[PDB]
Amino acid sequence: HHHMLVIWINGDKGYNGLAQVGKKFEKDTGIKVTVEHPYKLEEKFPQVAGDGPDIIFWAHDRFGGYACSGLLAEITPDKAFQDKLYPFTWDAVRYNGKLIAYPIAVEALSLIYNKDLLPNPPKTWEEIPALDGELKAKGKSALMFNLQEPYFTWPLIAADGGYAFKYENGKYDIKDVGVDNAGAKAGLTFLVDLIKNKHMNADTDYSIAEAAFNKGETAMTINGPWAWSNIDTSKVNYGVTVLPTFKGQPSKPFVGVLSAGINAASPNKELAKEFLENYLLTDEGLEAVNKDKPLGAVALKSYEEELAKDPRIAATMENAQKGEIMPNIPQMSAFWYAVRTAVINAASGRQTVDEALKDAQTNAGAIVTPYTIKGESMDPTLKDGERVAVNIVGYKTGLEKGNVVVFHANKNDDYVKRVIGVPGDKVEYKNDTLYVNGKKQDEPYLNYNLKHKQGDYITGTFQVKDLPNANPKSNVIPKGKYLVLGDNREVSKDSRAFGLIDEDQIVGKVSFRFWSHPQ
C-alpha cells in the first residue's frame, strides 16, 4: 500500500532494467520498487484502478481512455523539467488540456532482416511472394511477423490509404473512420493473399515470429526496437531498415510513445513523480532500461543525442515519419479491438476482407458507455446494481424489437426498458400474449416471471391506441414513437403507465453476453 511503489510495464519491454532503476531508488530512499508485467495489463488496469499499480507504462494511445475514466493523476512537471524532453512527446500525453503521463520513448515498427539470407531487403511488399519462393527452396521463409495484433499489420493496411480517425482542424472526428476504404481493403487483401498462397500462416504470433527470425529460419520480421536485444544474443547478422512500399506507397506504422502514468488512487503520487522525473528520465535511468531492451528514440534530449547516432534508431524514426502518432482518445480501445477482429477473421477465412472491414468500420466508431442499473423492474434480465455496457445510438440512426434501451425519462432521470414495438408496428396484449402485426410473438425473456407470478397475468390486456402519445384511432405505433415495457412486468412502471416514448429520448442499446457460444 503505502511505503513503496508498484509499477506495471509490458512483457516485451526492459523490465529488469527498469527494476535496476528501482533498486537505485530504494538505495537512495529506502522505498521499495516492485516491477510487474501482467498479461494484457492494458486491459486489467481499469479493472484494478481498488488496488492497481502506482505507475503504469503503456503506449500513449490508451491513456485518454484511462483519463476520461478518472483513473490517472494530472502530472505536475515544472518548466525546467518540461524543457528536458522534446515538445512533441508532451503532445502525445496531453488530454483535454492536461498532461496525463510522462513520455518515455518513441516507438515505430521497422523491417528487420537477416543479411546472410537476404543481403538486400525488398523495396516492395509485392516482391515478397517471389522472394518466399526462393527461400522455401532452402528450407526457409521470407517473412514472419505477429498477425494476432493489428499493430503489426496496420502499416501495410494504411499504406495505400487506411486510417483510424481523421484528425482535422485540431481534433479527431470520431465519425470519420478509415477502416473500410479502398486503401485498407487493398492492404488487407494483399495480406490475406500472402496467407492463401502459404507465404505466411494465419496463426503466426509474436513468439513464433521472434523465435523463427532469431533462429535463422525466416529472412525478415517486423518489430520494434525492444526486439533488438534478443537478436543481438542470437548472433544473427541483422539489419533494421525502412518498411517496403505497397502499390508505390510507404508503409505507415502507427507510432506510439511509451508513457508512464500515475494512478489517481495512489497514495504514493509524490514518490512516483520523484522516481519518474529524477531516476528514470535521466541519462542513467534510461540507459539501464535501454541496455535491457531498447526503448527507441527517447523523449529525453540529452540521452537521445547519443542514441540518435545508432543507424537502427535512424531507421526507426524514418519509419515513424511515414506513419502517424496514434490518437489517444478513449475510442482507440474500440478501434483496435475492431481491427484485431477484422484481421483475424480475414486471415483465418472466417470472413472476406469486405465483410471483416465493414464490421470493423462499424465497431471502431460505435461509442460504448458504462451504466449502472437501478431498481428491480427489469429483473431478472437486469438486476439492481448491475453494471452494463451501452451502445450509444446516433441521433436518427436502427432500433429493433427486443432491444433493451436506455432513454431520458426527464431532464434528471434515465430509464431502461425493452422495445416491444417500433414505428409502424401494430401491437396489443391479450392477457400475457403479445401480438405484433397480427402474429403472436413469443417473449422468452419473460419466461421466469411468467412462471413465478403473484397474479393471474404479469402484463395484462392492453392496446397501443389507449396509451399516452399514441394514435387513439390505431394500434399502429406512430412515426418516431416506441412501445417500451420492463421485463419485470408485474412491478414495472413503463409504457402501460406513461405511454409511448419518442425516438429522441433514446440514448443507447444495452449489450448482453449470451451464456452459450461455440467452442
Binding site: P370, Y371, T372, K374, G375, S377, M378, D413, D414, G486
Partner: peptide, 6 residues
C-alpha cells in the same frame, strides 16, 4: 457513474 432506472 451513469445510472439507469429499470
Amino acid at each position: 457513474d451513469h445510472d439507469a432506472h429499470a
